[PDB]
Ligand binder design. Sequence first.
Ligand SMILES: N#CC1(CS(=O)(=O)N2Cc3ccc(Cl)cc3[C@@]3(CCN(c4cncc5ccccc45)C3=O)C2)CC1
Ligand SMILES: [Cl-]
Lengths: 287, 305
Amino acid sequence: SGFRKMAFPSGKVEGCMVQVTCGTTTLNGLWLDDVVYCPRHVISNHNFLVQAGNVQLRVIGHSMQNCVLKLKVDTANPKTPKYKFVRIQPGQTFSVLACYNGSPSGVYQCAMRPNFTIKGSFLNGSCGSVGFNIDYDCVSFCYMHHMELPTGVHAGTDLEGNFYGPFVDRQTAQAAGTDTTITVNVLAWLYAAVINGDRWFLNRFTTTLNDFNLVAMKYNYEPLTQDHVDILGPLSAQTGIAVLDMCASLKELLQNGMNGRTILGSALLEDEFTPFDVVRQCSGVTF
Amino acid sequence: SGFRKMAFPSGKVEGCMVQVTCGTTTLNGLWLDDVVYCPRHVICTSEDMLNPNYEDLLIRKSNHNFLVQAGNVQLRVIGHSMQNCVLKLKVDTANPKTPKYKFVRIQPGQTFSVLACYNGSPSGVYQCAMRPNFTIKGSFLNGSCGSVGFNIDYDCVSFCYMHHMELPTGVHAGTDLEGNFYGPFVDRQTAQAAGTDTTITVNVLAWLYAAVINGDRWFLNRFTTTLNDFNLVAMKYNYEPLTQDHVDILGPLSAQTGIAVLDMCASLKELLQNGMNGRTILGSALLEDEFTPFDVVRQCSGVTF
Ligand SMILES: N#CC1(CS(=O)(=O)N2Cc3ccc(Cl)cc3[C@@]3(CCN(c4cncc5ccccc45)C3=O)C2)CC1
Ligand SMILES: [Cl-]
């Protein structure tokens, strides 16, 4: 029992965090094999100072790929895990290892919002902190922190330097678009509440995907697609509540509220747990 | 900017997780130097749990009855002893990944990170607090026994909790690393219930100061309160009494934001009275109590917005 916002164990990523200094700028880098990846806004080889723990690494080459700077170093990281660079879609979740001066200070779980921002917890010096998922023993790097927007939200790139969202890496008038709730994730979290014995919000009603999408559009909820319904199949079979039956519960929570009640200790409808996160936490998958 | 429930990086603890098997029972152990620490109920069967005599069960065991697995490597047990509700298995190999560490016993209201494990393999990390009723609202399934709670201030890992059991309400109970339970609990399957839980007042206050640091002041009012009047009201909402120690501990945050602790207490009094009215504080519609004054100073900036 219990439902927590759980992050992946960060150990395989901690062994890759280094400090990168170029002139007056100091931020974080990801050391994989003989390359250090970091935001290009950190800007010859000796101008780049790279520190891995107490050891100074020697930069022997440099190149740029989109908004990421790649510093070829002389030493391959002996702690390099099995890894892949993956680009995630909005709604997908990941763990963030927040670092300052190449030293990890915290780990949290979050989701890529539909407006491509992340509601993170970052201070000055956190640039170059990374987002990741673990699938068996392979680390899938999906995010590198670049900046904070005027509303306190964060923007960054995949590990190939491509920004998530209509953002650029520079000081200019940039604003996060109007955000929406990740519907498939709220539904998954309602199924996790049913698994943990919270059924007060269940009703005898069902709905059509068309009728529900008209309700979702009215409450700034992302449209629910047939793919989302198919993805919720296992949770529907485990609890005995059809996806459109759970959609009728969500419609009633949106039109009437919680009425002093909570779901999994929350008075808001939680949208940062994917259908896969719910299955993984309610099964004990290890890494 | 931003405020998240953040856990400590778990890498130093991952390198200590092992699997301990005694007969049919399989749970997690903490491998530090040449000792593996795990719940003593690993020597029990399900039947044994009603009234276990651990001394009688342990005396019938030998070293080779305890199987310890560290990754793909089998560790050899060369000795065993019991300290309160923890079993200590002396092994023939010191853990090369042993970090700098201490065993600390925490008080209610204190927070810590939990590395949840199954079969000696870590699966997730989360942040939580020791509730005033000594339970933890964790996320544990069968096989998670022996998972540990910790804080990592500087490079030293302070181990404060080892998971032992789930109570009938879905909450969890465990011990410090010396085997002493937190709360009036026993490692027996007896009628045990968590006491009535309360909100950690000093933590809610710290979180209100964190909201002021991040630029939110809608909840503040022009009133102050006496400490006693605050407690008379807060006790009616099932809030823990606020002591002079709590007020002293909130001193730095009070000086940083310019809001006296008893003025922040008046805002809390009013928040309990009125509710939120469709508003949120740091993206939350409830009053959050799992961030200590120390956590707020660590996560939030030194400059108030
Ligand atoms: N109410 C209740 C429960 C507990 S029990 O009655 O099955 N149980 C008695 C018991 C008594 C004392 C001790 Cl020290 C340990 C144990 C056990 C050992 C494993 N465990 C667990 C531990 N953690 C999470 C868990 C989740 C789900 C099933 C077990 C879990 C226990 O609680 C077993 C069903 C959840
Ligand atoms: Cl403490």
